[PDB]
Amino acid sequence: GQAPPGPPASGPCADLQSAINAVTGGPIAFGNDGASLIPADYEILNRVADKLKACPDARVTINGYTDNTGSEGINIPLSAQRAKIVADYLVARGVAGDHIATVGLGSVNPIASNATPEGRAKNRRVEIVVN
Structure with a gap:
Protein backbone atom coordinates (compact mmCIF):
# COMPACT_ATOMS: atom_id res chain seq x y z
CA GLY A 1 0.00 0.00 0.00
CA GLY A 11 5.95 19.44 2.89
CA PRO A 12 6.50 23.25 3.03
CA CYS A 13 9.89 23.64 4.61
CA ALA A 14 13.17 25.60 4.43
CA ASP A 15 14.38 26.34 0.92
CA LEU A 16 16.44 23.27 0.40
CA GLN A 17 16.11 23.83 -3.33
CA SER A 18 18.04 27.06 -3.32
CA ALA A 19 20.28 25.54 -0.65
CA ILE A 20 21.28 22.52 -2.71
CA ASN A 21 21.31 24.60 -5.91
CA ALA A 22 23.90 26.79 -4.20
CA VAL A 23 26.17 23.78 -3.77
CA THR A 24 25.50 21.99 -7.02
CA GLY A 25 25.73 25.21 -8.93
CA GLY A 26 22.84 24.12 -11.03
CA PRO A 27 22.24 20.62 -12.42
CA ILE A 28 24.24 17.48 -11.73
CA ALA A 29 26.77 17.09 -14.52
CA PHE A 30 27.89 13.56 -15.21
CA GLY A 31 30.99 12.35 -16.96
CA ASN A 32 30.59 8.61 -16.90
CA ASP A 33 28.30 6.25 -18.77
CA GLY A 34 28.38 2.49 -18.64
CA ALA A 35 29.84 2.27 -15.17
CA SER A 36 29.16 3.65 -11.72
CA LEU A 37 30.70 6.70 -10.04
CA ILE A 38 34.12 5.76 -8.72
CA PRO A 39 35.51 7.11 -5.36
CA ALA A 40 36.45 10.82 -5.14
CA ASP A 41 33.13 11.47 -6.87
CA TYR A 42 31.29 14.63 -5.79
CA GLU A 43 31.50 16.16 -2.33
CA ILE A 44 28.52 18.24 -3.43
CA LEU A 45 26.23 15.20 -3.12
CA ASN A 46 27.53 14.75 0.41
CA ARG A 47 26.87 18.42 1.07
CA VAL A 48 23.38 18.26 -0.48
CA ALA A 49 22.45 15.32 1.72
CA ASP A 50 23.26 17.39 4.82
CA LYS A 51 20.35 19.79 4.30
CA LEU A 52 18.07 17.04 3.15
CA LYS A 53 18.56 15.42 6.54
CA ALA A 54 17.97 18.80 8.18
CA CYS A 55 14.42 18.71 6.96
CA PRO A 56 13.60 15.02 6.32
CA ASP A 57 9.92 16.03 6.46
CA ALA A 58 10.33 17.31 2.95
CA ARG A 59 10.18 15.30 -0.25
CA VAL A 60 12.67 15.59 -3.00
CA THR A 61 12.17 14.67 -6.59
CA ILE A 62 15.30 13.93 -8.50
CA ASN A 63 14.60 14.53 -12.14
CA GLY A 64 16.83 12.99 -14.71
CA TYR A 65 17.15 14.12 -18.29
CA THR A 66 18.65 12.73 -21.49
CA ASP A 67 19.38 13.79 -25.03
CA ASN A 68 16.65 13.50 -27.63
CA THR A 69 18.91 11.84 -30.22
CA GLY A 70 18.38 8.48 -28.55
CA SER A 71 15.45 6.11 -28.89
CA GLU A 72 12.47 7.56 -27.06
CA GLY A 73 11.21 5.41 -24.27
CA ILE A 74 14.61 4.24 -23.21
CA ASN A 75 15.43 7.72 -22.08
CA ILE A 76 12.88 7.27 -19.30
CA PRO A 77 14.56 4.22 -17.55
CA LEU A 78 17.93 5.76 -18.39
CA SER A 79 17.32 9.12 -16.73
CA ALA A 80 15.65 7.24 -13.88
CA GLN A 81 18.93 5.40 -13.43
CA ARG A 82 20.89 8.64 -13.37
CA ALA A 83 18.56 10.07 -10.70
CA LYS A 84 18.77 6.85 -8.68
CA ILE A 85 22.54 7.31 -8.50
CA VAL A 86 22.08 10.54 -6.56
CA ALA A 87 19.41 9.04 -4.31
CA ASP A 88 21.71 6.14 -3.44
CA TYR A 89 24.34 8.66 -2.41
CA LEU A 90 21.88 10.69 -0.41
CA VAL A 91 20.54 7.61 1.37
CA ALA A 92 24.13 6.46 1.89
CA ARG A 93 24.75 9.82 3.54
CA GLY A 94 21.88 9.24 5.94
CA VAL A 95 19.00 10.73 3.95
CA ALA A 96 15.64 8.97 4.19
CA GLY A 97 15.26 7.05 0.94
CA ASP A 98 11.50 6.86 1.42
CA HIS A 99 11.44 10.66 1.18
CA ILE A 100 13.53 10.74 -1.96
CA ALA A 101 11.84 10.27 -5.31
CA THR A 102 13.82 9.43 -8.41
CA VAL A 103 12.27 9.89 -11.78
CA GLY A 104 13.37 9.71 -15.35
CA LEU A 105 11.90 12.25 -17.71
CA GLY A 106 14.17 11.57 -20.63
CA SER A 107 14.14 14.49 -22.97
CA VAL A 108 12.00 17.29 -21.58
CA ASN A 109 13.85 20.52 -20.96
CA PRO A 110 16.75 20.64 -23.44
CA ILE A 111 19.57 22.89 -22.30
CA ALA A 112 21.61 22.81 -25.48
CA SER A 113 21.24 21.82 -29.11
CA ASN A 114 21.36 18.08 -29.81
CA ALA A 115 23.21 18.85 -33.03
CA THR A 116 26.39 18.68 -30.97
CA PRO A 117 27.43 15.87 -28.57
CA GLU A 118 28.41 18.59 -26.11
CA GLY A 119 24.85 19.73 -25.79
CA ARG A 120 23.73 16.13 -25.43
CA ALA A 121 26.17 15.78 -22.53
CA LYS A 122 24.46 18.70 -20.85
CA ASN A 123 20.98 17.39 -21.62
CA ARG A 124 21.71 14.08 -19.87
CA ARG A 125 22.09 16.00 -16.58
CA VAL A 126 20.07 15.37 -13.43
CA GLU A 127 18.40 17.90 -11.14
CA ILE A 128 17.30 17.65 -7.56
CA VAL A 129 13.95 19.28 -6.98
CA VAL A 130 12.43 19.90 -3.60
CA ASN A 131 8.69 19.37 -3.19
Whole structure:
Protein backbone atom coordinates (compact mmCIF):
# COMPACT_ATOMS: atom_id res chain seq x y z
CA GLY A 1 0.00 0.00 0.00
CA GLN A 2 0.89 3.66 -0.21
CA ALA A 3 0.20 6.15 2.57
CA PRO A 4 -2.10 8.94 1.31
CA PRO A 5 -0.10 12.01 0.12
CA GLY A 6 -2.03 14.29 2.45
CA PRO A 7 0.52 16.04 4.68
CA PRO A 8 -1.21 18.60 6.99
CA ALA A 9 1.88 20.50 8.11
CA SER A 10 4.39 18.47 6.17
CA GLY A 11 5.95 19.44 2.89
CA PRO A 12 6.50 23.25 3.03
CA CYS A 13 9.89 23.64 4.61
CA ALA A 14 13.17 25.60 4.43
CA ASP A 15 14.38 26.34 0.92
CA LEU A 16 16.44 23.27 0.40
CA GLN A 17 16.11 23.83 -3.33
CA SER A 18 18.04 27.06 -3.32
CA ALA A 19 20.28 25.54 -0.65
CA ILE A 20 21.28 22.52 -2.71
CA ASN A 21 21.31 24.60 -5.91
CA ALA A 22 23.90 26.79 -4.20
CA VAL A 23 26.17 23.78 -3.77
CA THR A 24 25.50 21.99 -7.02
CA GLY A 25 25.73 25.21 -8.93
CA GLY A 26 22.84 24.12 -11.03
CA PRO A 27 22.24 20.62 -12.42
CA ILE A 28 24.24 17.48 -11.73
CA ALA A 29 26.77 17.09 -14.52
CA PHE A 30 27.89 13.56 -15.21
CA GLY A 31 30.99 12.35 -16.96
CA ASN A 32 30.59 8.61 -16.90
CA ASP A 33 28.30 6.25 -18.77
CA GLY A 34 28.38 2.49 -18.64
CA ALA A 35 29.84 2.27 -15.17
CA SER A 36 29.16 3.65 -11.72
CA LEU A 37 30.70 6.70 -10.04
CA ILE A 38 34.12 5.76 -8.72
CA PRO A 39 35.51 7.11 -5.36
CA ALA A 40 36.45 10.82 -5.14
CA ASP A 41 33.13 11.47 -6.87
CA TYR A 42 31.29 14.63 -5.79
CA GLU A 43 31.50 16.16 -2.33
CA ILE A 44 28.52 18.24 -3.43
CA LEU A 45 26.23 15.20 -3.12
CA ASN A 46 27.53 14.75 0.41
CA ARG A 47 26.87 18.42 1.07
CA VAL A 48 23.38 18.26 -0.48
CA ALA A 49 22.45 15.32 1.72
CA ASP A 50 23.26 17.39 4.82
CA LYS A 51 20.35 19.79 4.30
CA LEU A 52 18.07 17.04 3.15
CA LYS A 53 18.56 15.42 6.54
CA ALA A 54 17.97 18.80 8.18
CA CYS A 55 14.42 18.71 6.96
CA PRO A 56 13.60 15.02 6.32
CA ASP A 57 9.92 16.03 6.46
CA ALA A 58 10.33 17.31 2.95
CA ARG A 59 10.18 15.30 -0.25
CA VAL A 60 12.67 15.59 -3.00
CA THR A 61 12.17 14.67 -6.59
CA ILE A 62 15.30 13.93 -8.50
CA ASN A 63 14.60 14.53 -12.14
CA GLY A 64 16.83 12.99 -14.71
CA TYR A 65 17.15 14.12 -18.29
CA THR A 66 18.65 12.73 -21.49
CA ASP A 67 19.38 13.79 -25.03
CA ASN A 68 16.65 13.50 -27.63
CA THR A 69 18.91 11.84 -30.22
CA GLY A 70 18.38 8.48 -28.55
CA SER A 71 15.45 6.11 -28.89
CA GLU A 72 12.47 7.56 -27.06
CA GLY A 73 11.21 5.41 -24.27
CA ILE A 74 14.61 4.24 -23.21
CA ASN A 75 15.43 7.72 -22.08
CA ILE A 76 12.88 7.27 -19.30
CA PRO A 77 14.56 4.22 -17.55
CA LEU A 78 17.93 5.76 -18.39
CA SER A 79 17.32 9.12 -16.73
CA ALA A 80 15.65 7.24 -13.88
CA GLN A 81 18.93 5.40 -13.43
CA ARG A 82 20.89 8.64 -13.37
CA ALA A 83 18.56 10.07 -10.70
CA LYS A 84 18.77 6.85 -8.68
CA ILE A 85 22.54 7.31 -8.50
CA VAL A 86 22.08 10.54 -6.56
CA ALA A 87 19.41 9.04 -4.31
CA ASP A 88 21.71 6.14 -3.44
CA TYR A 89 24.34 8.66 -2.41
CA LEU A 90 21.88 10.69 -0.41
CA VAL A 91 20.54 7.61 1.37
CA ALA A 92 24.13 6.46 1.89
CA ARG A 93 24.75 9.82 3.54
CA GLY A 94 21.88 9.24 5.94
CA VAL A 95 19.00 10.73 3.95
CA ALA A 96 15.64 8.97 4.19
CA GLY A 97 15.26 7.05 0.94
CA ASP A 98 11.50 6.86 1.42
CA HIS A 99 11.44 10.66 1.18
CA ILE A 100 13.53 10.74 -1.96
CA ALA A 101 11.84 10.27 -5.31
CA THR A 102 13.82 9.43 -8.41
CA VAL A 103 12.27 9.89 -11.78
CA GLY A 104 13.37 9.71 -15.35
CA LEU A 105 11.90 12.25 -17.71
CA GLY A 106 14.17 11.57 -20.63
CA SER A 107 14.14 14.49 -22.97
CA VAL A 108 12.00 17.29 -21.58
CA ASN A 109 13.85 20.52 -20.96
CA PRO A 110 16.75 20.64 -23.44
CA ILE A 111 19.57 22.89 -22.30
CA ALA A 112 21.61 22.81 -25.48
CA SER A 113 21.24 21.82 -29.11
CA ASN A 114 21.36 18.08 -29.81
CA ALA A 115 23.21 18.85 -33.03
CA THR A 116 26.39 18.68 -30.97
CA PRO A 117 27.43 15.87 -28.57
CA GLU A 118 28.41 18.59 -26.11
CA GLY A 119 24.85 19.73 -25.79
CA ARG A 120 23.73 16.13 -25.43
CA ALA A 121 26.17 15.78 -22.53
CA LYS A 122 24.46 18.70 -20.85
CA ASN A 123 20.98 17.39 -21.62
CA ARG A 124 21.71 14.08 -19.87
CA ARG A 125 22.09 16.00 -16.58
CA VAL A 126 20.07 15.37 -13.43
CA GLU A 127 18.40 17.90 -11.14
CA ILE A 128 17.30 17.65 -7.56
CA VAL A 129 13.95 19.28 -6.98
CA VAL A 130 12.43 19.90 -3.60
CA ASN A 131 8.69 19.37 -3.19
